Each structure stands twice: as structure tokens, then as C-alpha cells.
Design a protein around this nucleic acid. Sequence first.
RNA 1: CGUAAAGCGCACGCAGGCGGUUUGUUAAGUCAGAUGUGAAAUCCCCGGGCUCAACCUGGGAACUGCAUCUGAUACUGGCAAGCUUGAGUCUCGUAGAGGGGGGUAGAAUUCCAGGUGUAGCGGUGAAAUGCGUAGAGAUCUGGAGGAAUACCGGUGGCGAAGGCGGCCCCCUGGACGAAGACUGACGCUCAGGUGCGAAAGCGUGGGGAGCAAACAGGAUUAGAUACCCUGGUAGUCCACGCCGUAAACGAUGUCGACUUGGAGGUUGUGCCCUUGAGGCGUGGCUUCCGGAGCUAACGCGUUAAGUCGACCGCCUGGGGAGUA
Lengths: 218, 88, 129
Amino acid sequence: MLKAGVHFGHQTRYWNPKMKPFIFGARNKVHIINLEKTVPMFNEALAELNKIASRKGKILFVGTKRAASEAVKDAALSCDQFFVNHRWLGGMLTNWKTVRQSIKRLKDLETQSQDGTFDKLTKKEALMRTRELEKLENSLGGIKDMGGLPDALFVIDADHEHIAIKEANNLGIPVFAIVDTNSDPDGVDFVIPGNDDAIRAVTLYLGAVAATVREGRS
Amino acid sequence: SLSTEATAKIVSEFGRDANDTGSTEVQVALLTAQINHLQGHFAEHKKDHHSRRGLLRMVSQRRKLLDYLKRKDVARYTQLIERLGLRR
Amino acid sequence: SMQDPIADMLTRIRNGQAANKAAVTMPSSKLKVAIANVLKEEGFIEDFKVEGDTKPELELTLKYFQGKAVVESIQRVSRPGLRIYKRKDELPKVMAGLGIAVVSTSKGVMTDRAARQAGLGGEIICYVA
RNA sequence: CGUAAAGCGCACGCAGGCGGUUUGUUAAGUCAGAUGUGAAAUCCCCGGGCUCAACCUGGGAACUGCAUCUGAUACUGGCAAGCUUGAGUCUCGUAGAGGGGGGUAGAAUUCCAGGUGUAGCGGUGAAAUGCGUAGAGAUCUGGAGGAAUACCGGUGGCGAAGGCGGCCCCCUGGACGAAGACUGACGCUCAGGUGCGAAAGCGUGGGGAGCAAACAGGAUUAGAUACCCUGGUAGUCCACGCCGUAAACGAUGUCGACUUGGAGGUUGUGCCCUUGAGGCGUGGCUUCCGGAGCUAACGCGUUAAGUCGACCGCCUGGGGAGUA
Ligand SMILES: [Mg+2]
Ligand SMILES: [Mg+2]
Ligand SMILES: [Mg+2]
Ligand SMILES: [Mg+2]
Ligand SMILES: [Mg+2]
Ligand SMILES: [Mg+2]
Ligand SMILES: [Mg+2]
Ligand SMILES: [Mg+2]
Ligand SMILES: [Mg+2]
Ligand SMILES: [Mg+2]
Ligand SMILES: [Mg+2]
Ligand SMILES: [Mg+2]
Ligand SMILES: [Mg+2]
Ligand SMILES: [Mg+2]
Ligand SMILES: [Mg+2]
Ligand SMILES: [Mg+2]
Ligand SMILES: [Mg+2]
Ligand SMILES: [Mg+2]
Ligand SMILES: [Mg+2]
Ligand SMILES: [Mg+2]
Ligand SMILES: [Mg+2]
Ligand SMILES: [Mg+2]
């Protein structure tokens, strides 16, 4: 529900004209979002997300900035949905078949560490390849068990994650994004204006979303 | 361009009153006075081409206004040219 | 100088439609209202109004369907430099009748279909699709 | 028609084309109907006859036109009366290398006279020509003359374009702003025409410091009618007249309307005002980056090469040739 925070925006220099309807005014040289408009769109968004959740659909969270990199991971633990916390590899969805073998490599790499078959005297067998675990999971950690394309997309930044938006549009997956004053709309099927970098604003979004999917999933 | 006292004198002489400045007769009279005054300026400054271009605009503007007045009312136009002694 | 106000009326609608503006305003005239009325009946423009008496301004409430411009294409036909007159049988039809052409007949400004039914020709103002 | 062929170098303007808004009137253009005419054949449509076809033939349609008559009045035009938003005049201010004429100042180059002073100076990649023991160069003092205005100075300003930089005076053009008043379509464009139009060049009469085509010499080079060096005339400067051409370029004609934004420069202006080398508005001009759109692409992008309207100019493969 409507509460403090979030209303703050970025400097009027970097505002995007396409978002003129959703700006309530220019306060202290920084645009502030119209919360009275955000709530009807935000509340309806969870209604649709709940509806997709009721169909056992798969939601994928896209957060790359360090201000929310850990936040999205926490949501992935509260609910059983998937997420991206680091750089979005170019083409994670357009050529998911190409990325499938990368996931398989992680599984094989993950398996070796579990039973200790990687415990060999040679440093190459013990150190060089095990580091591929850290590299691979930091990028594909949340997508290991997706097993296919996602049925919906949740994006915390509509401009910093414009690569992710493009793939969803190409594949037709519905896109839900928190589009900021400077961000680019028209690439997302669902518009949720508000802050995209404030810690107290981002946590509310995924925390709010993480609940509805659980209710919809039942 | 033209002194305020000289400008005010022409408006009263040709216009309905001291406040009627837009009349076609006041406009023509004002232009005619300036063109006549500038005759001495270009008599000595023959090479002042840049200022001459401004003079030609007054000549062209006056002709445009004169033709409009003739179309609107020929009798009043005839008196105006007679008083100013132009169109020779 | 503005020598054909009608194209200004049509140009403003086309530019307004491209810019997704809710409405467009311009100086009002009896001819413009007649064209605006015809568009209103055909459903191309939601509504029109005239404000002011000494310098009336015509206001057209543009409409969009499924987020896209309703007026797909509007273009002036008769122009001051070249005016077009058509007889009853020569009345054109836009997009095989899907569109409408505003024709000014002796009975007033009306669509080509109305003029054809009334059996009257006249100036062809524009094609609207 | 920015770069492929194609926007006159830029303006002012007659003829011509086109023209804001309201009422009345006219019914020329326009539109509806009718009448006359638009030969036959041919084409075309439905039929008929040669065994079919070609061919022949009946009727119709067509002959998109012209003229009259009778009506319609939306639009254009004529006519009358209007109107103020286009255009223009007036009042008060502001900025500016806008133009013309005259005067004057400082730095400096060169030259001339003199003092001090002695063997080099100058120049180049190196060198020489050249200048100098007749005392150069260097340095100080005085005088003469010409040309250009350091710093300010800035994708800053002004002008139609070309273009315009010290300072002062006289004459003078335009732009822009503030409210107010006034005229009431007087407008836009423009073939022919006329005017302006860098530099070089030409005519006559002056001036001539510097620079410098031509020219001369010394180098470089296989040669060097060049690049480099030392000299140097026209010219560059002034008055008047002529020439009328430039990559005269934004390689983008003029005028008007419309269409997301961001950051600067420059020049007016309104408002809040004690919490000023402040805060929010409104005009003119101007630089840069970019959205939609447009474009062959590059790119352009509210100063369009976007969306439209009026008018003019111009292009039609390369060469021959902007030549005969
Ligand atoms: Mg004046
Ligand atoms: Mg070329
Ligand atoms: Mg070319
Ligand atoms: Mg002109
Ligand atoms: Mg008219
Ligand atoms: Mg008639
Ligand atoms: Mg016949
Ligand atoms: Mg037969
Ligand atoms: Mg026959
Ligand atoms: Mg009339
Ligand atoms: Mg001419
Ligand atoms: Mg010269
Ligand atoms: Mg000479
Ligand atoms: Mg001489
Ligand atoms: Mg030389
Ligand atoms: Mg030429
Ligand atoms: Mg240039
Ligand atoms: Mg050219
Ligand atoms: Mg040009
Ligand atoms: Mg740009
Ligand atoms: Mg020749
Ligand atoms: Mg030539």
C-alpha cells in the first residue's frame, strides 16, 4: 500500500519524456512519481502475477545493480521462483538452447564437488576448475532448475536491464518492470512507476511480489 | 530615425488627432518626410549602400500603401498625393 | 503566409495523431466546422467544440483505437494552386469505399457517399482513411 | 534537387500565381436536369446471316465535347459592408566590428642622421647567394613615412549576401523588448527587370613601410622553368569608374503553420524578494547532443533533410562541354 519512500525520482535533466504522464511534479529539481497513479497499476500487477502464479507459471526476477543484487536472491528463498542477481548474459532467453549446455556443465561441476571426486593432488584438478563453479553460479545460479523459458518477467530497472526487456519482447513473454522517471516505457507490458535504486523501495517490491506468487501458487 | 517633435507634427497634421498614428495618410506622410530628409544624406554619402537599402524599403513601403489607398478610396488618395506633392 | 487554412486543419490532425495528442486546437471558421462535423459523424474524431466569439478557436477531441491513430491517412486533395472538381459519376472512393472523401456540394459539405446518394458533385476537399 | 545530374552569390520588386476571418448580394468558375448538336463506318454490348471463323449485318451503348434553357449556392471569383489574429505606424528603452565621412593614439617593421663599439651577421637539413673593416650585426638617441589595430577576443556580436575588430566625433540603416493606442488584409512569392556583390584583374590620378606573382641569383635534383634561401616589380593602400566571378558552402531558395526533449552562449523583460557572485517565469538570436519520423546510406532532427500549404529556380547517363 501507499507509504513513505518510492516517490523520489531522478534529476529532471535525465527524465524521459515518455514518462510525462506518470510524473506528479518537479520537487527540488528532482521529479517525484505520482503514487496515486502507481497504486492502481501496482496493485493490478500483483493481481495478474497471482493469476499467472495460480497456473503454476514460472516468474524470473532480474536485478543487476549492487543495491539490489542480494535483495533479489532473498526473494528467491522466500518463494521458489527464479532470479538473476548479476550481469544479464546477452541472450539468456533468445538462445536458451545454447545456454542449456552451460547449465549442464554446472550440474556436472556441482556433482564432482559433492562426492569428493575433485579431491586430487594436482592443483588443476582441485583449484583451476572448481573456480568455474563460482563463476558459473554467480551468473546462472538461479536459472539452474528453470528447465525452460519463463512465463513472466519481473525487472527492477527498465533501462539498466533493457537487454532483458528486449529478449522478453522478442519471445512474447509478459514483462513486469519498475520503470523509473528516466527509464524507457513501451517495452514492458506492465508499468510500475517508482524508484529503481532506493534500498527501501526495491525491498518493498520483491517482498510484495514474493508474497503474491506464494498465495497464487497455494 | 526621425525626431519625435517632427513625427508628432505630421501625425496631427495628417491624422484625425494626435493619437491616430496608424492611418494610411500618417504612415505615408511619415515615410515621405524621411525619404525627403535622407536625400541630403545620400547626396554626400553616395557609397552608403547599407543605409540606402533601408531607404529603398521606405520607398517600396510607401508605394504599397499608396496603391492600397487608391483602391480603397480614390478621392482621398488624390488629395494625399497633392498635399505631399509626389507621384511625379 | 497561411494561404490554405484547410491543409493547416488537416496537417494539425495528422501531426496531432502522430504525436498521440489528446486534442488539437486552431483558429475556427465556418468551413472548418463543416469539415469537422463530417469527421465527427464518420467517427474519425470523438467530438469538436468552438470557444470564443471575436477570435473563435476550434477544438477537436482526437480518438485512438487499440492505442493507434484512428485517422490512418489524411491528405488534402483540392488546393489553391490546383483545385479539383468532380461530377456525380466521377466522385472518388477511398480504399474501395472503406475511407471517405469530404466533398463540398451545393447542399453543403458531406461525404462522397452522401453526395453520390444525393446525386450532386462539387469540390473534393480531402481523403480520410 | 545536403553528398549521386540538379537551389540563381544575395536582395528589392512590375506582370503572373496564390491569399486570414464575418454578413449580404451576384451566380462567372463549379454542380444537377432538360433540349439541340456531336455523320456513317470503326471500338464496345446483346443478337442475326455466310457449314465455323475471318467477314457481313440489326438494335443499343459510346462519341468523356460544345451551345442554349431551367435550377442549386457549399466552395472559388466579382461587388458592398465589416472584423482583428497576418502585415504595418506611434510612444519608452536595450545591445551590437551594421554602413558612410573625418580626426586621433599606442606597439612595431623599414629607411635616414648621429653616439658607443668590433668581426662577423644573416640563412638552412647542410650550404651558398647576400650584407660587413668604406665599420655590418648588436645597442642608444632623433626624425620621416606607410600599412594593420596585440591583450580584450569568445562554435561571441551585427549585416540580405559579400562581409564588418584600436579610440573619439558627425550623418545614418536594421533588429529586439515592455505594456498601451492606432490603420483594418494594406499579404506571400516572383519570369523579365533593377540594385548589391570576396579576392584577383582593368582605367585615370595619388601613395608605397611590410608582404609578394613575374623576374634574378644561390641551393636541392638524373633534370627542378618547383618546393627551400637571398633579393625583388606589378599588386596589396587611397579617390573615382569598370569587371560581376568563388568550395560566393549550411554544397540545404523564400514565406507561413504544425510536431517528444536535454545542456550552453548571447541580449531584453516580468515576478518573489534579506537571508544574492538567490528563486521561479516570459521574448529575440545562436552553439552542441539527441526522440519519433525521414533518408540509398552517411546523417538531418522545433534553426528538419519530419508533417503540410503558396510561389519561383533548376536536373534528365559519362565524355565531347559550360566548349563551338
Ligand atoms: Mg521604422
Ligand atoms: Mg562531386
Ligand atoms: Mg552535385
Ligand atoms: Mg522577395
Ligand atoms: Mg478566402
Ligand atoms: Mg454558372
Ligand atoms: Mg458515329
Ligand atoms: Mg452463328
Ligand atoms: Mg453493328
Ligand atoms: Mg464571396
Ligand atoms: Mg529577374
Ligand atoms: Mg581588389
Ligand atoms: Mg589599380
Ligand atoms: Mg596605380
Ligand atoms: Mg621568395
Ligand atoms: Mg557560379
Ligand atoms: Mg561554410
Ligand atoms: Mg550552389
Ligand atoms: Mg544559397
Ligand atoms: Mg541531432
Ligand atoms: Mg563560354
Ligand atoms: Mg569558368
